[PDB]
């Protein structure tokens, strides 16, 4: 509903086609935070 650019478009398409289901993704705000912290010369990375 806020900042998943692909997720909200997929949700809109799914609602239009009846399937009330979502595929949550990563908020863009967290990516902005990651880029900012890396810009402060600090290595922040998502381990898998």
């Amino acid at each position: 509903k806020s900042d998943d650019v692909n997720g909200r478009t997929k949700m809109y398409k799914n609602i239009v086609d009846g399937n009330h289901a979502m595929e949550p993704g990563m908020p863009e705000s967290f990516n902005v935070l990651l880029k900012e912290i890396r810009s402060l010369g600090i290595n922040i990375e998502l381990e898998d």
Partner: protein, 468 residues
Amino acid sequence: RTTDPVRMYMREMGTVELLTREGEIDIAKRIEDGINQVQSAIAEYPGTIPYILEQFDRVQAEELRLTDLISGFVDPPELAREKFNELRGKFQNLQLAVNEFGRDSHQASEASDLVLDIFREFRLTPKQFDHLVETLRTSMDRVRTQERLVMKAVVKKSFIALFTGNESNEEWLDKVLASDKPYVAKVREQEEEIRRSIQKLQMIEQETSLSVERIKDISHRMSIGEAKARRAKKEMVEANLRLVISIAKKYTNRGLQFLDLIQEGNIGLMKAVDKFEYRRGYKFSTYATWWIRQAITRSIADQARTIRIPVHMIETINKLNRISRQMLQEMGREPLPEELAERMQMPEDKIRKVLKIAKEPISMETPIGDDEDSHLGDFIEDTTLELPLDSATATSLKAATRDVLAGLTPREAKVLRMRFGIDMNTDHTLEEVGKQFDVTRERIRQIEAKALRKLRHPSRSEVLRSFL
């Protein structure tokens, strides 16, 4: 005790004494003396004079710029031609007497000394000055690297003892091969490496015809002259930092901080020191102020705006503002574009164009209205985004196009698909569409025409009409 860098700069600069007239003349004399030693060191080189002679030969043929050759004459092409002809004749005499009569003979030494005296009455443009310096600098650096590589390969006192005259001579190699000390085994292996090194040596020496002692002494006098010159320039720059600050004080609150203006004025002062002339009799501040002001103004024109405006357009804007101020003072109201254009003797359209570009970008953190927790950046949209309604419409259009094309024979359906790029990466012209069918272009054209005519029938075009 303090954290402001400006205060620290004033502290460090204040520990230098302000120069007087006699001190300025003395430091200028030291600069000229060091430059003279550097020029004399360059002149004692077999390759330096030929370059100047060929440059003069090209210039006298009215093929090269006269300014690029020389910039002045030292006095203790009306005149340049005579002096350069004398220099050419004296070079011919030196080449006649350089080695036929003997290098150590009085003729060669007297000829070299008088060549030095003649060349001392010359003021070269710094570009070819630096070129001639760079050639010898590269030669000296290569010689130093080869010597240090040889010393690293062998690894001392023995090399130093036979360094004076036999550093590059094969006598050193022969004698060391004759040596039979316990460590000369690996050293002889390393002597092989020295062979590979010294083979790279003589082609340099025959390029200079100076062996090792002469080039070392030339490098030495060049180093002393450069050091003296650099110390003198540093002294004058340190003395005139206060003048730099006094000049830069007036350009504060114009997009740049005080320290940036100070540094740019320091660069301008360096340039002024680099091209000062004490023979003119004027004080240093007179010449230095122009360069410091130029540096500061250019730096403001280049680094005071987020969207850079060229320097000439900046001057145009400033002169427009000055004329607007004068006209508003004269008539009591804001000048109109037409009147400003009339006064500037410039087209009104150009005046409007200049007036539309004099804006500094607004910050996104500026509080909006009377609030303080709201910012302008929260009211800026993302116009590049695609509305989800548009994407859903695109998907529906894709599905409807597929459904409509499914109501055709495969030939025309695929012809349209390939001619419009539907479900493929690239669009295709008529030739590639024809090639797959093996048919020519015209049949493809009429196939597409038939498909378009059939798809315009309202029996199978009502669903596609709603997208218009």
